[PDB]
Design a protein around this ligand. Structure first.
Ligand SMILES: NC(=O)c1csc([C@@H]2O[C@H](CO)[C@@H](O)[C@H]2O)n1
Ligand SMILES: [Cl-]
Length: 190
C-alpha cells in the first residue's frame, strides 16, 4: 500500500484567552513534521461584520470567519504533507494542529479531527484575561458581557451533542502543565 497520503490532524479549541495558540506552538516544538493553522488568521474584514440590536460587532460567530479560505489553507497543508516524506522502504505521518475559538461547531470539519482538545476557563478569570489583551478594534466597554461570553455559552450549548469525543482542559493550569498533559495524551494516539 503506497505511503504519503496519511495525516494526523489535532483540533485545539476553547474559550478566548485560554492559551490555545501557546499550547499549539509548544506541541509543535515537540512533534516532528508538524504545522499549525490559526483560525484567527481567517476573520473577514470589518465591513463584512454585522452588528446586533445593541450595536455590538458580531465577531464571535462563524459568519465572522472566512471558513472557506480556512478550508483552502488546510487543503494546501495536506498537499504539502504528501511531499513532506521522501519515498523509501516499508510510516512517518505528518501532523497538523488547527487551533481556534470556534472549530467544533463547523460541520464540514466534523470528521477531520483525529484528536480534539478544548481549553476552559471560568467567567471571572476569562473576563480578567480578556481585559489584559488589546484587540483591533479595541473591546468596547461591555463587549465581554454583551457579546463574547454569551456567544461562548451558545458554542458550548452547540457542543453538548457533538459526534466525536473532546478532551476538556483546565486553562488556568500553567503553560508547561497543559503542554505535558496534552503531549501525554497525544503520543498514545499517534
Ligand atoms: N478583527 C478581529 O480579528 C477581532 C476583533 S475582536 C476578536 C476576538 O478574537 C477572539 C478569538 O481569538 C474572539 O473572542 C473575538 O472577539 N477578533
Ligand atoms: Cl519520493
Amino acid at each position: 500500500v503506497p505511503r504519503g497520503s496519511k495525516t494526523f490532524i489535532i483540533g485545539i479549541s476553547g474559550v478566548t484567552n485560554s492559551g490555545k495558540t501557546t499550547l499549539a506552538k509548544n506541541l509543535q516544538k515537540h512533534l516532528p513534521n508538524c504545522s499549525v493553522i490559526s483560525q484567527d488568521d481567517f476573520f473577514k474584514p470589518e465591513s463584512e461584520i454585522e452588528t446586533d440590536k445593541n450595536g455590538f460587532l458580531q465577531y464571535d460567530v462563524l459568519e465572522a470567519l472566512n471558513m472557506e479560505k480556512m478550508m483552502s489553507a488546510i487543503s494546501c497543508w495536506m498537499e504539502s504533507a504528501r511531499h513532506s516524506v521522501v519515498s523509501t522502504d516499508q510510516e512517518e505521518i505528518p501532523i497538523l494542529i488547527i487551533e481556534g475559538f470556534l472549530l467544533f461547531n463547523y460541520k464540514p470539519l466534523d470528521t477531520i479531527w483525529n484528536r480534539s482538545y478544548f481549553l476552559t476557563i471560568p467567567y471571572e478569570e476569562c473576563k480578567r484575561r480578556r481585559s489584559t489583551r488589546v484587540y483591533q478594534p479595541p473591546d468596547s466597554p461591555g463587549y465581554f458581557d454583551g457579546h463574547v461570553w454569551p456567544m461562548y455559552l451558545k458554542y458550548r450549548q452547540e457542543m453538548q451533542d457533538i459526534t466525536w469525543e473532546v478532551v476538556y482542559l483546565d486553562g488556568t493550569k500553567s503553560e508547561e502543565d497543559l503542554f505535558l498533559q496534552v503531549y501525554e495524551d497525544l503520543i498514545q494516539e499517534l
